[PDB]
Amino acid sequence: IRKGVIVPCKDLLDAEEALSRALEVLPAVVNVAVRDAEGKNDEEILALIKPWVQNSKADLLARRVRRLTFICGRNDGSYPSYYTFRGPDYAEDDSIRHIEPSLAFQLELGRLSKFKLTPVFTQNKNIHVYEAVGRGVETDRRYFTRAVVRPGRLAEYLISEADRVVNDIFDALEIIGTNKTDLNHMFINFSHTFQVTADEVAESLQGFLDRFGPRGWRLRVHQVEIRINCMRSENDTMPLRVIITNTSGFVIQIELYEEKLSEKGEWVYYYVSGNAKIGSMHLLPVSTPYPTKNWLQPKRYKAHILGTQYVYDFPELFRQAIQNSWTEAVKKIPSLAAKQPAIGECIDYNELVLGDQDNLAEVSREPGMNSTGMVGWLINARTPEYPDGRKFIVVANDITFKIGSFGPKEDTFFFKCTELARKMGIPRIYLSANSGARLGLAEELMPHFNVAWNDPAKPEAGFKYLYLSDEAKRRFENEVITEEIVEDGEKRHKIITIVGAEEGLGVECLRGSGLIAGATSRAYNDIFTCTLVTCRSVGIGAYLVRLGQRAVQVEGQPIILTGAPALNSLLGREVYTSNLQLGGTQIMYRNGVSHLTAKDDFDGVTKIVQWLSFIPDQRNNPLPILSPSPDPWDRDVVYTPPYKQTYDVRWMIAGKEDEDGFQPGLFDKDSFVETLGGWARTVVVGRARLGGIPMGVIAVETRTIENITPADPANPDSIEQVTNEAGGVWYPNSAFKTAQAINDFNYGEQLPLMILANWRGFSGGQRDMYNEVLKYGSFIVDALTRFEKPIFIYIPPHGELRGGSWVVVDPTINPASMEMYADEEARGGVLEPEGIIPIKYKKDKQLETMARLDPVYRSLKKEMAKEGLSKEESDNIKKKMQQREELLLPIYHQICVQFADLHDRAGRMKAKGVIRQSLQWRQSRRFFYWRVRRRLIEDDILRRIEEAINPANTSLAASPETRSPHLVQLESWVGIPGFKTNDREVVEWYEQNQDRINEKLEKLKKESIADQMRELXXXXXXXXXXXX
């Protein structure tokens, strides 16, 4: 136990004899008092106590006594002076002076850890001022004041006491001077258990701070901390710590906290303040080290040498991406820019940190100070699409915090974030910069474990096992699983399994990794999911990129699974030279793991805030539609594709740039955003807007694209393979791209789909067949049946939809949400007109029609039929016809081709009812604007009808005009004659009679509630339920 020593000497010289002889009662802490209040000795009293300690440097050391105090009682009421020597050599800590060690704890100081401290002279022994300069950067220079109060009087005592103590601090800061100080702080600790409560003390707080405030502003004082107690709650204390900061020339910052244990073993800052909970510092330890200026700079640099922004710099990257989002929209849409919220107030974020019962809590604290290798925020961004506000979650790893590795704490956090984004419906964005899961060994068992050899003299003769000494075995026991086996007559505890105290070494990390891997897989299908490769995303991190589906890769950041050197070691030779040689953009964007490639960390954010513009703010919320604004809805589609040559299909979607002017596409000018344009370029996937209505687009590339698969370095006998993916055909990769895109616009994104169908089938070739073309063909069908929002399959001019292709895109796949249209000059059959001709219109069938239309051939036929001509005569008719038919054959072939093409024509399609309407490409925009809008408002009204009615397809005939059995009831409530058609008239009706539908829904809701009540021996049960 720490033995207490107290000795009251009479003199300074005679005090030495009560040291060397008083230490003899020690087989700890020692105090020495004096009776010479003659002079207020300083420095010379320090040169009068140092000779007694440097001489007995081994005397105090041997007894193992830690602290040595020197109290000096003054006869005028003066607070006695105390001097303490601590440690091995007892160097005398200048920090604890003129105050008892018990008071040290009360003085704090463990909060000025990130500072070089040098104290200064104080006229009042109670107050202590310190010069503080940031350990790293010298630009920071501050004066911290530390005062502790304890009474001498046997109600409004404390408020009058406060005036005396703060005036004393102000008068001392005056003599030391304001000098050159960036910030100044003062702490006033109260030892008192006063019976009163902070609510009245806050009213009185306001009173004296406005008087002292002006003076405090001059000294350059930024904040003051008062630490009082309130015994009336039980009559158990409520320690109320209060911080008052002078931010903006006027205080207006009174943060009223409460000292409570977080359950985790730390005392935290739980505030019940009056600055409207949107302030600083909440559920933070009392041990926070008052950070310096530029304290973020070392961490910033560490992230920047890895080529990534420091994690806490990302919220401001998002503010500027939104800032840019308005500056560009005010250009395109002038006037309607009045809702711009300035440079600040763009976004309104709040940190997320694991709560008391591990339930995420919204905190607004200092950047940095992250307890775990992961951080999150709930951001309310005022986008021009949702100018009132829109929320989303942003999760990211701290690449400085243990190279950003995934430990169990990091996992539980990431999870509880995904869990929240789901619970709110708001999208989730992950900023990846990690090092997979955490590795680790038990460090404590490294300098303690023993080895049992076969031969102790020559250890190279193999070792039997590894054991632990009995004294070192009792030290752990729960950190190691040991078996006892006596060898050489020793109690040897052989290590049979190592556990280790510390977490995050092995399997505990894999378990958590698996949890979040599944959580991300689940989330993708519910809320909008997105990832960003801001830096190397390895192992589990690499998978959350794929489970997160929608990924953006910064050019020089790899999505690696197994380390580039780890692979070289496995092969035994230096095959791979870079982590990007197998993880980089040239792999992931070129195989479709990456949807977009961004030049830098900000370019990434920018591109993300771009997808979020297309996506509804919540889960089941209406799309971010705007006024027609740049490209009006009432404009005709100018670019029309040629029938001769090939065309960049992109020109049909947004528009073609030309020498003379610009011919627009069917979507809004430059609203198209192509994704996965590095993988299976035979299909163009992207998002675009149609008169303000955002929607998903899939189109077919007509030009013969060539993907060149790279050479494998692992096999020196591997060369790059030149493969030409001929345009307008479906290949394993193209099919996969299509299918993926569909599910991506389906889950979370919730977008209507536009499919400019132009494929002439599937790749039936041996190589493509073996490459599972059939597997990925199915994936399109599977994906289409899962969809909910409207899908429009529109065959464009020149566009084809032959056999294999048509089957996997037909509206009877999902009749409830699909709608098929075909262009007036489009074609669609079972086979190409060049392909049917050698099956239904063979050589013999063409000659029967030749001996019908051609006059020469049927006249020569009349010669053979009449007979009466010899062997040399019949040869003439044969050599006359088999010359005529030889020259007619090429044009007669083309006749059947045109004949067969008249079957494949659009008209036939409407006649057999496989399409709704024939469409003129010129006015496609004008038609789809009102058909997309009509379907979107109607789909929801029907969804609402069903939700009111039931609180819980069948034929080739199924056409969208009957997609729901309620479209008959809604038809009669509306009253429009041309209901199935006149899309514009319908939309405008709903908009006007918004109140009449909600009138009819409530009528139906009360009617459906009456059915459920009635559906609920049975009579006896009901009687009993009535009695209850």
Residue numbers in the entry: 1186 to 1212, 1253 to 1379, 1386 to 1464, 1469 to 2187, 2196 to 2259, 2300 to 2311
Article passage:
Biotin-dependent acetyl-CoA carboxylases (ACCs) are essential enzymes that catalyse the ATP-dependent carboxylation of acetyl-CoA to malonyl-CoA. Eukaryotic ACCs, instead, are multienzymes, which integrate all functional components into a single polypeptide chain of ∼2,300 amino acids2. In addition to the canonical ACC components, eukaryotic ACCs contain two non-catalytic regions, the large central domain (CD) and the BC–CT interaction domain (BT). Here we provide the structure of Saccharomyces cerevisiae (Sce) ACC CD, intermediate- and low-resolution structures of human (Hsa) ACC CD and larger fragments of fungal ACC from Chaetomium thermophilum (Cth).
Using molecular replacement based on fungal ACC CD and CT models, we obtained structures of a variant comprising CthCT and CDC1/CDC2 in two crystal forms at resolutions of 3.6 and 4.5 Å (CthCD-CTCter1/2), respectively, as well as of a CthCT linked to the entire CD at 7.2 Å resolution (CthCD-CT). In all these crystal structures, the CT domains build a canonical head-to-tail dimer29, with active sites formed by contributions from both protomers. The connection of CD and CT is provided by a 10-residue peptide stretch, which links the N terminus of CT to the irregular β-hairpin/β-strand extension of CDC2. The connecting region is remarkably similar in isolated CD and CthCD-CTCter structures, indicating inherent conformational stability. CD/CT contacts are only formed in direct vicinity of the covalent linkage and involve the β-hairpin extension of CDC2 as well as the loop between strands β2/β3 of the CT N-lobe, which contains a conserved RxxGxN motif. On the basis of an interface area of ∼600 Å2 and its edge-to-edge connection characteristics, the interface between CT and CD might be classified as conformationally variable. Indeed, the comparison of the positioning of eight instances of the C-terminal part of CD relative to CT in crystal structures determined here, reveals flexible interdomain linking. The CDC2/CT interface acts as a true hinge with observed rotation up to 16°, which results in a translocation of the distal end of CDC2 by 8 Å.
